[PDB]
Design a protein around this nucleic acid. Structure first.
Lengths: 53, 124, 111, 173, 86, 178
RNA sequence: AUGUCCUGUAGAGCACUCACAAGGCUAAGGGCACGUAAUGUGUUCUAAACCUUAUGAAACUCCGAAGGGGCACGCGUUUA
RNA sequence: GGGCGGUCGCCUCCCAAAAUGUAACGGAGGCGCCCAAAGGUCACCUCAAGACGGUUGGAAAUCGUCUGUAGAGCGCAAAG
RNA sequence: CCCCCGUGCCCAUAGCACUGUGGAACCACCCCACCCCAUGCCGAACUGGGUCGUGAAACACAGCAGCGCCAAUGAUACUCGGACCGCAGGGUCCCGGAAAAGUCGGUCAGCGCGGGGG
């Protein structure tokens, strides 16, 4: 599914002790690298989620 | 001289139609969808105007329908191509109706000319 | 705008008393004259009695709604007296929706 | 010019000389018939012009008119048309024709006989009758005159249809 | 693949309509009207939609589920004459 | 009150003095007012027009929102939330005492200003006439100012019939096409 | 036999779709014209198109069925 | 028919033969998305479009208005 | 039997226009405005309190065709079916189901349903 900074985005969250990648994307309209969030993880409540690699 | 594009299509089928009207003078109707080769009706008025007059205008009640798609003949075992034929097809509609007098239907006399089938004139 | 605006809540209201029928209806009228109530149980019904003034008469809008919310919250509620009810909420929420419903459970009704 | 007949079926309606016939007078339906000799005295000179009688087999006497014209599609064997009879309190269909007659003062610049091919007019008539008296086709065909449909020599009263502004005879040589 | 003009060589496509419950027939929560694969609840197929209509049916059992926003579902309280119990 | 009164008892009875009406409130009231202007986003691609936005509220304060026309252009301009407009609701009683700065000022200037509107009127109490690009006010610098209005004024008045549309609107104030 | 619901062909018909003929009118329209501050003055013709006159159709609209299915009431031939 | 070309998955139907209901070197529009939001809740607002004359305003973009089988639009064919 | 805030049935045999009228109990305008509510701006139809005034188009009632709107078994158009003219259409009869416009009429209904009265 293509590759080479042009179209499409390849980002995918990160949450501590709440093991889950969120596994979805959007696009680089908003800032790069940094990517603040919130939202539910495994279950329980909402957990970390702050994005990184 | 009919549509200007708006895609090809059309199919077949014969019967009669619907386009007959009580004429004011001296009518004329088709009788089923006879034979007129488009490039026949492309010689319908001019043949009805050899020299009827310098000027002169009346009324008709039809218009070229057509396309047919004939295709070459190198080996007919395929799909199609395009029209390249053309035809009108009608019912028993009016198409002439003179308004003079002594002439009566002189131009509805050699109308039957380009007419392999039967097309009376009647009157109304 | 009323006989042109008022159309938002009508059939959209009756969709809990007709989608459950476990809650009552509710008239609700402006007029700013008298107050009344006059409710009917279940969307498949529309006939019941009520009352009138002959109580405390001094016209108002705010403090006059919460009144019948208990002053007459059983006087007419014969059948069952109380049995899971829901308010109408035709228009907005000036306070007549509050001081009425917030004075509804005052005397009776389980909302 | 008599009546009788009856047949509730299209049997004697498709057998040499005859017709089909229709009637719906006040408490008088049924589908008669009658032959077809001098049965083309409609659009000739009797187009609502005058109203005789008929002497039907048994009772009454209804004058009536012609109820437009129709002849036959393509051929000339008038398949069943219609027939109005003044005895109703609301149908439509009026027969107020507009002809073409004369020497055609078209040889002024260029133009032939008054054409017209239609078979429909802006008309109306209240009750049900359709008198016979109107022209419209003539009036110095040139420019700064014209003569169509919109008011003219109009039957009796005013007109009612939808939008009074058809086309009909006109000029344009 | 690859194509051009003066020729073409493309496929075509449809799907299965499959109406299912066939009017006055028992009831339960069958299905009927795959006008929209997502579908939705219905309870009791009265036969709605724009304009006056509604399928002459009346035959209680259970829920229903049907069509799209095209015509109409039902959800009506009423068996057919029954109303008391069963 | 002030004008409202020289409107409640002055240009209110006059109508009945001429020819009455079935009501003591039959007479036309202050139906609609508004102002209307905003000649589209000229100065800058929408970012400097703000220095022509607040300029609408150059007599009072009531933060106008400019509105938008209808998005369908993509010729001239126009998008999902462009300006192109005006409006704003600011009637009231002072609105009467606002005619004090309306049915008064302006006339004393506006080029070859002599009279106000040559008939025209009719149909409604909203006769469409007004402004060019003049304020007539000095209540601020007016040097630091550098815009350019245009457009007019509408203000309806619940005056359908011509002899109301522009009837009262005659003995109404004084500055007018005499 | 009968109860009950629908599909909407065939066609009518037309008013959202494509186009159709004639008249009134339409030129916010365009140009032939001694003009010439929009040109106020004036003119001529489709043309969009409203009404009227009253056009077509597989892919048209508030119309409308044969037929068919669903089950039900009941038995005539037979395991349907 | 060899076969260069053209064909190889999904989706709109026309023609499909008013329930399902096929084909085709018969025909037309594309794609293997979007979106932290055109998602859920509550609320108010009818869209293109003409006319009234007034702004940088030689149409058109500004606004008030009646009309509006509402002819908008609702994320990109198509039907509903 | 009275006028009358109102919930359905409904969905143009209640779309608009003409006459006039009731206001005190029905209903409109209004009044006062800072505060609950805080309206793209203001508080004007969304606001808190009400005794002037009036009911004027908007609120009501019957007469009320200018066109709509319901408008028929009856002839046509359409059709499960039977032999045929006959060229596919198209067409005769037998022969059931059985559009629409046109024929009249009527249209500003009507019944239960919570009331302020002589």
């Amino acid at each position: 599914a293509k590759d080479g900074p042009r179209i499409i985005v390849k980002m995918e969250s990160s949450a501590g002790t709440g093991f889950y990648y969120t596994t979805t994307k959007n696009r680089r309209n908003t800032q790069a690298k940094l990517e603040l969030k919130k939202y539910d993880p495994v279950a329980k409540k909402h957990v970390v989620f702050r994005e990184k690699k | 001289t009919k549509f200007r594009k708006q895609f090809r299509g059309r199919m077949t089928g014969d019967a009669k139609g619907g386009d007959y009207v009580a004429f004011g003078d001296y009518g004329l109707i088709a009788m089923e969808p006879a034979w007129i080769k488009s490039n026949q009706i492309e010689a319908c008025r001019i043949v009805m105007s050899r020299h009827f007059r310098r000027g002169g205008k009346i009324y008709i009640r039809i218009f070229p329908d057509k396309p047919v798609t004939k295709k070459p003949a190198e080996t007919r075992m395929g799909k199609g191509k395009g029209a390249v034929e053309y035809w009108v097809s009608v019912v028993k509609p009016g198409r002439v109706m003179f308004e003079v007098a002594g002439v009566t239907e002189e131009q509805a006399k050699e109308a039957f000319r380009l007419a392999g089938h039967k097309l009376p004139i009647q009157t109304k | 705008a009323t006989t042109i605006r008022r159309k938002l809540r009508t059939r959209r209201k009756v969709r809990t008393t007709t989608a459950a029928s476990g809650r009552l209806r509710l008239s609700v009228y402006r007029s700013s004259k008298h107050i009344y109530a006059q409710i009917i149980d279940d969307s498949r019904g529309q006939t019941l009695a009520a009352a009138s003034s002959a109580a405390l008469k001094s016209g108002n809008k705010t403090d006059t709604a919460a009144a019948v919310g208990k002053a007459l919250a059983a006087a007419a509620a014969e059948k069952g007296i109380k049995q899971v009810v829901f308010d109408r909420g035709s228009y907005k929420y000036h306070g007549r929706v509050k001081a009425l419903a917030d004075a509804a459970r005052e005397g009776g009704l389980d909302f | 010019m008599e009546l009788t007949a009856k047949p509730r079926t299209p049997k004697q309606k498709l057998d040499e000389s005859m017709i089909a016939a229709v009637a719906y007078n006040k408490e008088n339906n049924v589908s008669f018939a009658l032959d077809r000799k001098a049965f083309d005295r409609a659009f000739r000179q009797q187009s609502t012009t005058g109203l005789f009688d008929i002497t039907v087999e048994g009772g009454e006497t209804f004058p009536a008119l012609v109820k437009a014209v129709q002849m036959d599609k393509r051929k000339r064997a008038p398949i069943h048309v219609d027939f109005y009879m003044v005895t109703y309190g609301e149908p439509v269909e009026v027969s107020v024709p507009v002809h073409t007659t004369g020497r055609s003062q078209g040889e002024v610049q260029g133009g032939l006989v008054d054409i017209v091919v239609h078979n429909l007019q802006i008309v109306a008539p209240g009750p049900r009758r359709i008198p016979q008296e109107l022209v419209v086709d003539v009036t110095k065909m040139n420019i700064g005159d014209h003569i169509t449909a919109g008011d003219i020599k109009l039957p009796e009263g005013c007109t009612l249809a939808a939008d009074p502004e058809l086309t009909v005879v006109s000029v344009l040589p | 693949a690859h194509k051009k003009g003066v020729g073409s060589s493309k496929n075509g496509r449809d799907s299965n309509p499959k109406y299912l419950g066939v009017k006055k027939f028992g009831g339960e929560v069958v299905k009927a009207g795959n006008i929209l694969v997502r579908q939705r609840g219905t309870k009791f197929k009265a036969g709605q939609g724009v304009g006056m209509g509604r399928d002459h049916t009346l035959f209680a059992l259970s829920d229903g589920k049907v069509v799209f926003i095209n015509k109409g579902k039902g959800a009506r309280f009423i068996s057919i004459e029954a109303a008391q119990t069963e | 009150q002030q004008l409202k009164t020289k409107y409640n008892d002055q240009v209110r009875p006059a109508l009945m003095q001429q020819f009455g009406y079935s009501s003591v409130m039959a007479v036309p009231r202050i139906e609609k007012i508004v102002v209307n202007e905003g000649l589209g986003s000229s100065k800058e691609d929408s970012k400097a027009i703000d220095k022509a936005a607040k300029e609408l509220a150059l007599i009072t304060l009531q933060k106008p929102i400019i509105t938008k026309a209808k998005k369908s252009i993509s010729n001239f301009k126009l998008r999902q939330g462009m300006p192109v407009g005006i409006k704003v609701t600011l009637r009231g009683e002072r609105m009467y005492v606002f005619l004090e700065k309306l049915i008064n000022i302006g006339l004393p200037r506006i080029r070859d200003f002599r009279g106000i509107n040559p008939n025209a009127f009719d149909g409604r109490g909203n006769y469409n006439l007004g402004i060019k690009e003049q304020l007539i006010f000095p209540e601020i610098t007016y040097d630091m100012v550098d815009k350019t209005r245009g457009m007019d004024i509408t203000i309806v008045t619940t005056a359908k019939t011509d002899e109301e549309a522009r009837a009262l609107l005659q003995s109404m104030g004084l500055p007018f096409r005499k």
